[PDB]
């Protein structure tokens, strides 16, 4: 468990580790937006 005064952020921290995956996905949205050029 996190320190008491950051407890509010618990559900954010459950999701943070996944964020690097989203960068990979985001490169494919970008390439879709320029038509895989």
């Amino acid at each position: 468990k996190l320190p008491e005064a950051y407890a509010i952020f618990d559900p954010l921290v459950d999701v943070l580790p996944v964020i690097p995956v989203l960068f990979l996905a985001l490169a494919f949205v970008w390439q879709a937006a320029v038509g895989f050029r």
């Binding site: 999701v15 989203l22 960068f23 996905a25 985001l26 949205v29 320029v34």
Partner: peptide, 27 residues
């Protein structure tokens, strides 16, 4: 839930492409 935050975070990236493509930017 956590489904609120990952929705908010999940939309950031695509919203950046959207803003840049409608404002015809250096994509």
């Amino acid at each position: 839930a956590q489904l609120t935050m990952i929705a908010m975070i999940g939309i950031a990236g695509p919203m950046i492409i959207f803003l840049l493509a409608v404002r015809r930017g250096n994509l």
